[PDB]
Design a protein around this ligand. Structure first.
Ligand SMILES: CC[C@H](C)[C@H]1C(=O)N(Cc2cccc3ccccc23)C[C@@H]2N(C(=O)NCCCC(F)(F)F)CCC(=O)N12
Ligand SMILES: CC[C@H](C)[C@H]1C(=O)N(Cc2cccc3ccccc23)C[C@@H]2N(C(=O)NCCCC(F)(F)F)CCC(=O)N12
Ligand SMILES: CC[C@H](C)[C@H]1C(=O)N(Cc2cccc3ccccc23)C[C@@H]2N(C(=O)NCCCC(F)(F)F)CCC(=O)N12
Ligand SMILES: CC[C@H](C)[C@H]1C(=O)N(Cc2cccc3ccccc23)C[C@@H]2N(C(=O)NCCCC(F)(F)F)CCC(=O)N12
Ligand SMILES: CC[C@H](C)[C@H]1C(=O)N(Cc2cccc3ccccc23)C[C@@H]2N(C(=O)NCCCC(F)(F)F)CCC(=O)N12
Ligand SMILES: CC[C@H](C)[C@H]1C(=O)N(Cc2cccc3ccccc23)C[C@@H]2N(C(=O)NCCCC(F)(F)F)CCC(=O)N12
Ligand SMILES: CC[C@H](C)[C@H]1C(=O)N(Cc2cccc3ccccc23)C[C@@H]2N(C(=O)NCCCC(F)(F)F)CCC(=O)N12
Ligand SMILES: CC[C@H](C)[C@H]1C(=O)N(Cc2cccc3ccccc23)C[C@@H]2N(C(=O)NCCCC(F)(F)F)CCC(=O)N12
Ligand SMILES: CC[C@H](C)[C@H]1C(=O)N(Cc2cccc3ccccc23)C[C@@H]2N(C(=O)NCCCC(F)(F)F)CCC(=O)N12
Ligand SMILES: [Mg+2]
Ligand SMILES: [Mg+2]
Ligand SMILES: [Mg+2]
Ligand SMILES: [Mg+2]
Ligand SMILES: [Mg+2]
Ligand SMILES: [Mg+2]
Ligand SMILES: [Mg+2]
Ligand SMILES: [Mg+2]
Lengths: 185, 190, 190, 185, 191, 184, 192, 182, 184
């Protein structure tokens, strides 16, 4: 049950969108990506100069869906701020790190997790090889961009994402995944 | 079936579902298990209410068995970030992350009704796979408990040691006991 | 399929689902098993009706087999907190936490229709795990029963000892027997 | 798919309710009872003197839910006519018999069935005893009211409801469950 | 996996599964939930043993949560019918119809080991359908309870009223408490 | 789920107002019918202005894909194609089907090409019919892909034998798209 | 698939499944979760062994995660009732009621092999229904715990209080730690 | 299972002191193998026993039942890997009498860290984590002793699934020799 | 229902008395353990007389197959292989592993060769380990098949890329068997 606000009637999320706030509040799949991409394109058309605010409370999900959002963020004119509230894990933390430089935030008790991509492969040896080569290339792609966005080496990113790596908001700032911990007003 | 209320309000007539009507008077309902959807909604409502009026109190109704710790912390951090005081009112039950959020309301403005139940306990989780994966999961949930216990100590005035001991198992408190503990400030009487 | 009713005003025809139409005249329907969703809705309706008119009676219709004790206490405490008298009217059945809420209506304004069924019994629950966990769960449900019995004693005029004995097993009462017991004040005749 | 009628757009059932017609067209549960009770209360408030029409096409259902409807019918001022179309069985036929005296009808090919209440009990001997005593008292309550409404003895009602007893509309009139078979006009 | 024991006898070597070996020595194992299969087996063993020797004691081991009342009464009536004394020995647990059968052993020869658990409670059942069917089922289980209580009164020396009250809910007894109650005669102490 | 914008439109309907169609899911008949209807509507609205087909899709039904393909080729306006996230299978086929010079992908978008998938069960002659059908369908797909990319049918056959993942730049090199759309 | 062993006797050639062969030399295998079937079998074997020889030691092998408390007490009481000493030997694991039985072996004849795992914890159970039914179930499991702890105190030399504290949660012990605790007498070291 | 004349084939092999570990290791398998070892010892305390290993591993405690019984008894227990030894299976392969641990040339040996699970309260998860970590240390220490490799190296090499050929297993010290065709 | 013969033997045990082993099912560890035990037993009984391995099998576990393979090569006696019905996958591998000159198939027996099948799930590095493992296993299989057939590793790789069904005569031509056993 999503509440409605009247001032024109808006569901609460649509009301936030009126003030250029986009909610990434779920597992990332193609539906979520298509919606966020559409919202980004709409907000750019509305105003190419004003900041956009991407709220992130997400365990991650599809890498290609994540890259749909990533590429649209980088394509458009306006700065897209990222703010981690609750959790950003996996492709969620990747998108957190993808916000406009100097405008990537987390609230003090927000959790950030980084790890290597997950997948599956079944069938013939050559099919397994193709799937393995694909996920390994995808991992190099992710690591390269994360290196660029954080200032950490690809070597360090590889090592630090080998297993689940949980970071506090302050640790995420130290790592270069965010720029600042947003403290209470 | 959520009922609708219709008001003839000077500039015309407006129809509200009952929860949206409560939101018009700065009342947010945390009335279910805490997951990311619930957290996203409450966070959005908090941000909206601050924008509407940065000074007037917000009222967070809590009837919840708790749920996701990270989802709970989304709500917690948004409460602490915004300018307005967020009152918390426990009606029915606040358990687990629900009682954590009850304790997170503005100092002096945390309430429970007389027969409301408050329960505190340690976080729950799971881990499967390799020994090193189990270790990572264990270290994570232990650090999460320390985080929770530290904040609860700050909010209640109880020591971290006492919080640890009192949350080892399920600990059910009456509204009055929750006040004594420092989880709330007052039992709201008729 | 819930029917819609349309009433013609000067600024248009206002359309109501039948339950929302009843709410316009301060009638709240407790017509299902009591869970947190039902409790949150009823609590919200009570708060809304008080704000709308702090003096006029509210009418709580009860056709319910009961359900969650904490959800029931959410409704109970909200009834006792608000200014207006909340009349209770049992139609069909009030069982368990449903009969508790029937007995919780404003003194002199608790009713049942002549063929309505009222049932009282002890709380139901479950516990699994370690011996100390079972002990905690047992102590909790026993304390919950004491609370329920104490309040029922206050509301009915019966002794706690009698309430304990009469709720040991399922105890079915006619409307007239419920009046004799003190669970209601009057059998509403045609 | 329930059709809409425009004169005020109404779903067909809401349109019938505008002319004081209530549809009991399903198995009787608490939801159905709450709705019918609310409709009865609303119609009384609208006009305390004009007849209400209760359409009955129902296999019956919950006895307590049925008694919610029954007591509300008897409580309110207006006469509630009952009209059996298709079938009235069990608590459905009980409610058919509960309509205003002289205003209980069935169409010629409508089926009326009467039988004893159904239930269940599991657990300890004393629990089974409580459940048995409860359903037996419920049966006595039903039979007593049916006797009053039909003019048949409690003894006869007991015997005739021991097993499933199917009646034609004409037989239901003879029995005293209805007053008239509504013939074509 | 039930182990086998092999003995050299006078007429050759003989192989027994462990339970069949115990039966050779007039020991019957009631070691499971009581259903008709269990009852038929125990009844057959009792009849066989009685034929083997109408005089020598039989030993009924009881580690059972109870079960079917009629199946229990098959065992009960066969015990009472046959000539030999049937000793009863509770090891682990006797609950419900299991404790009834424990109490049904030969007077003076009903035992429990010190940490054995004895539980008594009222019969359990179910009924669904028409009101008159529910009435028949209720009357049946109530009459069955009386029958059980009457016999338990006779075997324990407790009043029917006390039995009724003490079996209203689950009533767990230690071996010593079961002796005090009259369900057994002695707590068998270590030799 | 889907936010509303007021200037009231759901976000996707708002994009459709500016001639943007979203192919953002697995391709089935429902998706195809919707996209076909949108294409026909946009042509009727303006026969000369470009249409923009967003593609984030793992592919799906070949016949549903061909419903979209044929409608694109039938209508007057140029249909630009833009791969964002992923285009796989029939999704990449449709990406390659956009107006010549107006097929794009964003830099980190993934393009995958492979042979059609299917099933057959029953009698030997039924299996033969199903096999002949899917083989003819593959030839149809390969022929069109050859025409659209400039690659030989022989090369297409070889390169689609197994799953073949391409970067946006590789897709441009292959002739599946015309340009990698760089940040503005 | 349980293998068979054949030994040639004087009055013929005799075949045993491997477990039955071990039983011939007074070895009983508690090698599974403890339920009533397992208890009934072990009780029968103990009675049989006692009858066969009231004086020679019996060897109870324990590789078990535990299980039913009442089934465990069937085995426990039979061990204490019979004449012969019952040695206990933990190989692999003894947990819960399994450890309880390990500790119940003849004094001085309770063993574990060096890498065997011993676990102690409080009893587990369930209860559902009316408040008074839950109370009865709670009182029952609590009394059962007290019974277990009292006997464990007697068998180990540890106080009931220490046992209560050390069984509050899962407590894993090495064979050497189990000896130190008093659950066993000796760690059986490899032979010459 | 075929019969030879009467013995089932496995019981016939047991007559010549051959024990088959040919399945996933659970308590039933461990109890059987332990019983066979004890029996063979009683039959002859001096003659070698032959433990065939074609197993994906399984329960660590069940594996240790077999391990401790092997080390307790007098006779040397040869180990022979045929097909596969993985996990606790390779642990037992390495546990055979020194100089008498073998694999056939195409046999596969796999080593990795123990697997497990934990659910419930934070303190319960901590207990479970500490338990599996201790268990890993126990396994690694013994493997170090049996192979001559350092505990540090074992830890590194078992972090993920590590597949070895028979020759590589010999090089590692898990076996002594690759048994070549007669 | 396996019939009994009295001269008492179940039919398969009777065949084993004459040094005939039946590989008549999917290859798993149980099947491998049984066949290994039978091979060891027979050798003990007579180190010089031929053993006959009947193969009617769709294949199965590669490691289980290698248990049988290595035991065949280890023991002294020649192990003849005879394909009746079908030998597929690891089944055809074992058919090819029989004593040189003593590998047979009946005229209508079917022989199928293909690459190994498997699965992998989890982290990228776990998928890599699983991929490297199955690829090394394939190389091992291909190398041995090359040695046993006289075909090049390159040809084996190409011919096992997909399911490759061969007649008994084609299997002889390939070098998987030595002779097609004709009616006597
Ligand atoms: C030159 C601008 C972009 C690059 C170009 C174009 O490539 N696409 C394809 C496209 C489709 C969908 C998502 C995309 C995300 C990133 C990049 C391209 C995307 C649509 C866009 N349009 C708008 O934005 N129109 C303004 C209204 C927008 C609103 F959302 F409000 F409808 C239509 C006019 C047009 O030329 N382009
Ligand atoms: C107080 C947050 C700061 C000032 C900042 C910013 O960080 N975020 C990111 C954000 C996104 C989502 C949830 C957040 C919760 C806590 C903190 C930040 C959150 C959006 C916010 N905006 C509004 O609130 N705009 C007024 C309209 C608000 C309404 F809800 F009504 F739409 C847009 C203008 C802006 O600078 N910020
Ligand atoms: C009468 C003072 C109550 C005690 C106080 C307060 O504690 N709460 C928290 C609360 C939240 C939810 C349910 C509650 C039930 C019982 C008691 C408190 C409850 C909300 C309430 N508000 C209203 O009722 N506003 C009038 C409009 C109400 C309407 F429903 F129409 F929106 C907001 C202003 C306020 O100070 N309080
Ligand atoms: C003297 C009328 C009854 C006795 C009395 C009262 O007891 N109840 C409780 C009640 C609640 C629900 C169902 C009931 C069925 C039968 C009897 C009582 C029922 C509500 C009713 N109300 C209306 O009918 N108001 C007119 C508007 C009604 C409309 F439906 F249109 F909203 C509110 C004013 C009031 O005093 N009472
Ligand atoms: C005391 C039983 C009476 C005298 C009688 C008789 O009623 N029944 C029926 C019967 C059947 C089954 C169970 C019974 C249990 C209790 C009572 C009767 C039962 C069989 C019995 N027989 C034996 O016991 N024969 C000796 C051999 C017995 C052995 F078990 F070893 F086979 C056959 C000769 C005979 O007259 N009766
Ligand atoms: C393309 C037009 C063709 C030649 C012709 C015709 O074949 N079809 C069948 C048809 C049906 C459905 C999808 C189709 C897709 C591609 C081709 C044909 C399709 C309908 C169309 N109409 C419109 O487009 N009318 C303008 C309004 C359109 C709007 F979408 F806005 F409603 C009706 C007048 C008419 O002659 N034709
Ligand atoms: C020490 C047991 C006492 C003396 C006594 C007795 O109480 N029970 C009941 C009983 C039944 C089942 C399990 C029991 C476990 C512990 C204690 C008693 C148990 C049977 C036993 N019998 C034997 O052991 N007979 C020797 C043969 C034994 C063999 F196993 F081989 F068959 C029959 C002769 C007898 O008097 N008693
Ligand atoms: C002094 C030897 C050992 C130390 C001692 C003892 O501790 N156990 C317990 C035990 C039980 C089960 C498995 C065990 C594995 C390893 C170590 C001990 C095990 C049984 C053993 N017995 C035999 O082996 N008897 C010879 C016959 C054996 C045969 F298998 F054939 F039955 C019984 C005589 C006895 O003193 N012991
Ligand atoms: C040629 C294997 C050598 C000589 C050696 C040895 O390594 N193993 C281990 C082993 C175990 C299981 C399967 C094996 C398969 C291939 C190779 C070794 C295998 C057992 C064998 N034995 C026999 O064969 N004994 C004769 C009786 C045989 C019979 F089957 F009939 F029981 C025991 C005496 C012995 O030294 N070895
Ligand atoms: Mg940007
Ligand atoms: Mg605040
Ligand atoms: Mg009030
Ligand atoms: Mg009336
Ligand atoms: Mg007798
Ligand atoms: Mg003893
Ligand atoms: Mg040794
Ligand atoms: Mg050979």
């Amino acid at each position: 049950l999503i509440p409605t606000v009247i001032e024109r009637a808006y569901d609460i999320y649509s009301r936030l969108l009126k003030d250029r706030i986009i909610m990434l509040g779920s597992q990332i799949d193609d539906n979520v990506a298509n919606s966020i991409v559409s919202q980004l394109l709409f907000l750019q058309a509305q105003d190419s100069e004003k900041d956009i605010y991407l709220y992130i409370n997400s365990p991650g999900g599809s890498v290609t869906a994540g890259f749909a959002i990533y590429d649209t963020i980088q394509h458009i004119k306006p700065d897209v701020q990222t703010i981690c509230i609750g959790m950003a894990a996996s492709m969620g933390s990747f998108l957190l790190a993808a916000g406009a430089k100097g405008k990537r935030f987390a609230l003090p008790n927000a959790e950030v997790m980084i790890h290597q991509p997950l997948g599956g492969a079944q069938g013939q040896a050559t099919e397994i090889e193709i799937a393995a080569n694909h996920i390994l290339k995808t991992r190099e792609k992710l690591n390269r961009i994360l290196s660029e966005r954080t200032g950490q080496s690809i070597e360090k990113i590889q090592k630090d994402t080998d297993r689940d790596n949980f970071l506090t908001a302050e640790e995420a700032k130290e790592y270069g995944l965010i720029d600042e911990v947003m403290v209470p007003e």
